[PDB]
Amino acid sequence: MKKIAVLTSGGDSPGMNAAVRAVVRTAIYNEIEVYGVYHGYQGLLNDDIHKLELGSVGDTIQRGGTFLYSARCPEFKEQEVRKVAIENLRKRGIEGLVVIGGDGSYRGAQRISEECKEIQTIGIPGTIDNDINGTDFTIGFDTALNTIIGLVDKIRDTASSHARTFIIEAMGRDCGDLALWAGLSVGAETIVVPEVKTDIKEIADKIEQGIKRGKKHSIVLVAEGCMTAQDCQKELSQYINVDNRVSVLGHVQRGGSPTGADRVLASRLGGYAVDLLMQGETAKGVGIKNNKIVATSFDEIFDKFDYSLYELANKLSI
Amino acid sequence: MKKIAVLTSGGDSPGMNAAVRAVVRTAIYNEIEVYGVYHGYQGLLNDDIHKLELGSVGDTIQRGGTFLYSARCPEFKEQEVRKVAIENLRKRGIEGLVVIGGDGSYRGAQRISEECKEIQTIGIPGTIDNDINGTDFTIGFDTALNTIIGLVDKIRDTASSHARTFIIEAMGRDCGDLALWAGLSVGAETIVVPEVKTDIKEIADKIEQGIKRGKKHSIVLVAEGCMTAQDCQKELSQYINVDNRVSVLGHVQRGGSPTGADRVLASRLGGYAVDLLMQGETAKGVGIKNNKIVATSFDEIFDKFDYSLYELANKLSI
Numbered sequence: 145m146k147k148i149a150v151l152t153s154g155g156d157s158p159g160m161n162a163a164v165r166a167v168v169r170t171a172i173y174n175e176i177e178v179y180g181v182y183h184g185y186q187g188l189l190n191d192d193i194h195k196l197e198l199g200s201v202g203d204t205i206q207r208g209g210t211f212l213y214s215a216r217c218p219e220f221k222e223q224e225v226r227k228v229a230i231e232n233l234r235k236r237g238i239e240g241l242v243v244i245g246g247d248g249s250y251r252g253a254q255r256i257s258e259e260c261k262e263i264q265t266i267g268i269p270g271t272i273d274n275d276i277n278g279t280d281f282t283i284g285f286d287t288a289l290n291t292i293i294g295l296v297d298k299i300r301d302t303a304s305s306h307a308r309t310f311i312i313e314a315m316g317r318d319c320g321d322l323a324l325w326a327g328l329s330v331g332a333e334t335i336v337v338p339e340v341k342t343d344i345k346e347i348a349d350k351i352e353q354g355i356k357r358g359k360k361h362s363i364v365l366v367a368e369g370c371m372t373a374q375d376c377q378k379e380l381s382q383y384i385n386v387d388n389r390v391s392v393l394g395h396v397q398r399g400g401s402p403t404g405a406d407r408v409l410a411s412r413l414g415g416y417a418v419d420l421l422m423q424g425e426t427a428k429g430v431g432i433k434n435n436k437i438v439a440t441s442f443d444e445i446f447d448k449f450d451y452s453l454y455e456l457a458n459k460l461s462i
Numbered sequence: 463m464k465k466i467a468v469l470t471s472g473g474d475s476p477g478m479n480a481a482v483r484a485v486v487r488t489a490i491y492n493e494i495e496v497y498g499v500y501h502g503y504q505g506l507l508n509d510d511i512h513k514l515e516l517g518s519v520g521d522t523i524q525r526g527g528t529f530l531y532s533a534r535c536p537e538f539k540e541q542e543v544r545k546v547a548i549e550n551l552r553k554r555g556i557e558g559l560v561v562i563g564g565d566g567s568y569r570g571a572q573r574i575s576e577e578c579k580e581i582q583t584i585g586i587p588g589t590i591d592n593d594i595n596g597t598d599f600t601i602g603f604d605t606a607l608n609t610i611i612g613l614v615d616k617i618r619d620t621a622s623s624h625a626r627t628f629i630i631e632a633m634g635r636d637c638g639d640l641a642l643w644a645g646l647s648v649g650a651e652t653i654v655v656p657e658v659k660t661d662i663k664e665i666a667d668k669i670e671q672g673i674k675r676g677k678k679h680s681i682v683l684v685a686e687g688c689m690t691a692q693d694c695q696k697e698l699s700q701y702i703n704v705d706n707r708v709s710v711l712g713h714v715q716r717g718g719s720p721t722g723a724d725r726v727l728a729s730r731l732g733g734y735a736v737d738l739l740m741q742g743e744t745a746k747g748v749g750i751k752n753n754k755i756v757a758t759s760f761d762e763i764f765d766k767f768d769y770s771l772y773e774l775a776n777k778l779s780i
């Protein structure tokens with residue numbers, strides 16, 4: 145393991161920079177040359193590979209997004225195209241490749257191990273979802289959660305007092321963890337998530353039942369996987385008279401400085417990824433499982449929901 | 463278990479309110495009457511006990527500190543004094559008492575179980591320290607960590623550019639976790655903690671060795687357990703010419719809105735505490751051990767340091 149490349153792919157999440165920083169610093173410290181791949185897997189095809197120094201990642205740990213960029217490269221689903229990406233690494237004597245992204249970007253990394261015995265591949269879970277296997281939390285999740293806390297606190301403060309209701313759309317993809325954790329933290333009366341059978345009657349039953357009993361504003365937190373905020377406002381107007389503040393949080397949830405948890409967590413995994421490449425291991429995602437740093441094969445990853453925590457959220461509301 | 467009292471003791475930490483909120487809501491939901499004890503154990507002697515309703519804890523989850531207050535009651539170390547506190551609960555038909563504080567406040571709770579078979583006692587780890595046994599993190603730690611991130615980022619931004627060095631004092635008590643996690647997150651070149659043998663020569667060796675090699679500012683993060691910030695500035699002037707920004711963070715670290723992690727973590731433990739009182743258990747601290755909610759006897763608690771994570775911090779700096 146004498147040369148390592150690293151790349152960022154998929155949705156950008158807070159701590160991607162810290163993770164890169166960790167990989168670069170760890171590698172150079174172990175006398176490995178490191179190459180920054182720009183623009184996700186698009187970069188990989190464009191031969192947008194550049195050698196990185198210790199200074200390349202100064203003043204980054206606190207930075208939102210990724211300083212190598214990210215892309216969608218839907219063409220990376222093809223053997224023939226991926227051939228051109230492996231050559232670009234092959235020709236340059238790169239033996240290890242580190243991928244920081246979601247479960248989609250992992251699949252790309254799994255392929256490269258399958259289609260090139262010469263390149264070791266490791267995955268680092270840079271995503272907001274908490275959707276990734278073999279890790280309890282992903283790098284981005286804790287930051288997003290607070291971003292939602294904050295923006296909710298701001299909708300509250302910038303609102304008319306006539307507003308009884310806050311139908312708030314939170315980002316995950318197919319995973320209701322964000323909305324459950326965010327819902328709990330802003331003390332939301334309803335939480336709508338793809339994992340629990342959603343009773344709109346019951347939710348309107350509740351809003352009518354406790355506001356009009358003297359509640360300032362109820363807030364409903366909604367997982368994008370489950371439905372849109374406007375959908376929830378539509379479906380709730382089917383029982384009850386409410387249209388008060390359909391706030392569609394969106395891509396702001398992806399931005400902002402990583403919180404402490406993500407910087408630390410990113411750094412540990414960024415390091416670990418480098419250790420495992422030197423150990424000669426491959427085709428694994430790294431993570432934190434039961435407060436323990438671990439590696440899980442891309443096999444096991446592609447072959448979570450705490451209903452307890454959800455029930456508690458509802459105990460705490462009424 | 464028909465009546466529960468709850469109290470906050472010791473240093474106030476972010477999420478104490480969320481924890482109370484959780485206890486109150488959970489108890490009432492299970493048709494238990496709940497009593498708010500004001501001013502820590504001082505309240506307990508003053509008979510500052512008041513019945514709480516669901517509304518008593520509205521608009522609190524996001525609030526810093528505790529709305530029942532906290533006190534130092536050094537007199538609570540005495541059998542005779544504690545007699546008067548047990549009567550005050552005894553006379554009122556209170557069968558369970560919930561204590562939210564540090565390991566000091568736990569000891570008080572352990573006593574009451576030992577000196578009253580009639581009152582079940584549970585402890586919830588509301589403290590910044592991360593000093594408490596049977597829990598990986600305490601309620602307050604994640605919030606504090608970001609408070610340090612933020613205030614450091616502000617010292618940076620509000621500083622002259624002539625300043626090469628930032629000797630920053632972080633709060634823990636006898637535990638260097640905060641300074642290690644904070645140190646890592648602001649990318650600090652030195653981290654001074656009570657657990658590792660501190661080489662001041664080596665630290666000045668490093669500042670001289672890399673600033674004067676073109677580094678804007680080095681930051682040194684210092685655990686209060688280990689030494690004062692001024693002590694570190696003094697001891698460093700014994701090798702090298704530096705006195706640039708001895709910022710003594712202090713009690714601001716205790717304040718501020720809890721982050722997401724602490725609200726959630728507080729809520730889970732606040733609930734769990736109530737469950738365990740109904741289950742008939744006693745003299746335990748609750749917590750989260752290897753991503754699992756657990757209870758540990760006050761016995762085991764009074765009978766952590768990741769040197770790996772510390773080593774990584776130093777790999778990532780130079």
Ligand SMILES: Nc1ncnc2c1ncn2[C@@H]1O[C@H](COP(=O)(O)OP(=O)(O)NP(=O)(O)O)[C@@H](O)[C@H]1O
Binds near residue numbers: 154246247249272
């Ligand atoms: N199933 C797949 N097979 C091969 N390559 C893939 C696959 N899925 C994704 N990729 C490649 O990796 C990129 C990742 O896209 P995407 O699935 O949006 O990222 P993600 O890593 O899941 N992040 P997020 O969108 O936050 O979940 C795609 O643009 C492709 O370039």
Ligand SMILES: Nc1ncnc2c1ncn2[C@@H]1O[C@H](COP(=O)(O)OP(=O)(O)NP(=O)(O)O)[C@@H](O)[C@H]1O
Binds near residue numbers: 503537539565566590
């Ligand atoms: N060893 C003890 N025995 C009996 N009572 C105690 C003991 N230590 C503390 N107390 C009581 O509990 C309070 C807690 O004080 P302290 O040790 O400051 O709190 P803590 O819970 O450790 N929080 P922190 O200061 O953040 O660590 C004291 O003021 C006493 O009222």
